[PDB]
Scaffold this active site. Sequence first.
Site, PDB file in Angstrom:
ATOM      1  N   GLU A  35       0.857  -1.212  -0.101  1.00  0.00           N
ATOM      2  CA  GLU A  35      -0.118   0.007   0.007  1.00  0.00           C
ATOM      3  C   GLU A  35       0.993   1.389  -0.028  1.00  0.00           C
ATOM      4  OE1 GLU A  35      -3.051   0.457  -0.520  1.00  0.00           O
ATOM      5  OE2 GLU A  35      -3.882  -1.412  -0.375  1.00  0.00           O
ATOM      6  N   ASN A  46      -7.871   9.457  -5.374  1.00  0.00           N
ATOM      7  CA  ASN A  46      -8.377   8.304  -5.754  1.00  0.00           C
ATOM      8  C   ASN A  46      -9.506   9.340  -6.783  1.00  0.00           C
ATOM      9  OD1 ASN A  46      -9.001   7.103  -2.507  1.00  0.00           O
ATOM     10  ND2 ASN A  46      -7.603   6.573  -4.118  1.00  0.00           N
ATOM     11  N   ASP A  48     -12.717   9.411  -7.312  1.00  0.00           N
ATOM     12  CA  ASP A  48     -13.721  10.012  -6.575  1.00  0.00           C
ATOM     13  C   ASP A  48     -13.376  11.348  -5.864  1.00  0.00           C
ATOM     14  OD1 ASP A  48     -12.745   9.112  -4.351  1.00  0.00           O
ATOM     15  OD2 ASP A  48     -14.466   7.816  -3.783  1.00  0.00           O
ATOM     16  N   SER A  50     -11.714  11.333  -3.040  1.00  0.00           N
ATOM     17  CA  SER A  50     -11.127  10.891  -1.773  1.00  0.00           C
ATOM     18  C   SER A  50      -9.488  10.886  -2.060  1.00  0.00           C
ATOM     19  CB  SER A  50     -11.542   9.863  -1.288  1.00  0.00           C
ATOM     20  OG  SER A  50     -11.397   8.515  -2.168  1.00  0.00           O
ATOM     21  N   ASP A  52      -6.264   8.390  -0.028  1.00  0.00           N
ATOM     22  CA  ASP A  52      -5.840   7.584   0.858  1.00  0.00           C
ATOM     23  C   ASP A  52      -4.363   8.027   1.452  1.00  0.00           C
ATOM     24  OD1 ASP A  52      -7.901   5.824  -0.355  1.00  0.00           O
ATOM     25  OD2 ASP A  52      -6.344   4.675  -1.308  1.00  0.00           O
ATOM     26  N   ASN A  59      -8.829   5.423   3.676  1.00  0.00           N
ATOM     27  CA  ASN A  59      -9.328   6.402   2.862  1.00  0.00           C
ATOM     28  C   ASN A  59     -10.253   7.538   3.511  1.00  0.00           C
ATOM     29  OD1 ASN A  59     -10.577   7.440   0.651  1.00  0.00           O
ATOM     30  ND2 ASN A  59     -11.179   5.100  -0.278  1.00  0.00           N
ATOM     31  N   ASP A 101     -14.902  -4.562  10.427  1.00  0.00           N
ATOM     32  CA  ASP A 101     -16.302  -4.060   9.688  1.00  0.00           C
ATOM     33  C   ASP A 101     -16.948  -5.220   8.896  1.00  0.00           C
ATOM     34  OD1 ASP A 101     -15.526  -4.015   7.070  1.00  0.00           O
ATOM     35  OD2 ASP A 101     -15.390  -1.806   7.045  1.00  0.00           O
TER      36      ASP A 101
END
Length: 129
Positions: A35, A46, A48, A50, A52, A59, A101
């Site tokens: 990563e 990203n 959209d 956003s 990271d 994110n 989650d």
Amino acid sequence: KVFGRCELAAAMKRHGLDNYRGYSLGNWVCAAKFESNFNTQATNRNTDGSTDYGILQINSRWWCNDGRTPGSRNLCNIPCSALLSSDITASVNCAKKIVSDGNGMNAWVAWRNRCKGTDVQAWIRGCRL
Ligand SMILES: [Cl-]
Ligand SMILES: [Cl-]
Ligand SMILES: [Cl-]
Ligand code: NA
């Protein structure tokens, strides 16, 4: 900070990640390598809008507030800048929430595509832990 492989493993172990939700330490080290190349200051934007952040590329659409991702949540209740610190505590604590989650480590695309199903123990081999 750019961590060494065994330095990061021992930090992650001290912070309770070894076998956290069933994921052995080498999974977490493998994910961090792909990563962020073990760099706490890594950021990536990203499509959209956003971004990271940090050694586990958490994110801003869901997990932290960076002031520029409209309509996002802040489920770890932290500024995203906290995830860039040389102290990995904030990143680890947030990662424990993410992995709890429901989808496990599949939340990390690099883990799914480059660590899952591989001999991840190799990532901690040789380290004094
Ligand atoms: Cl392992
Ligand atoms: Cl925002
Ligand atoms: Cl799982
Ligand atoms: Na956010």
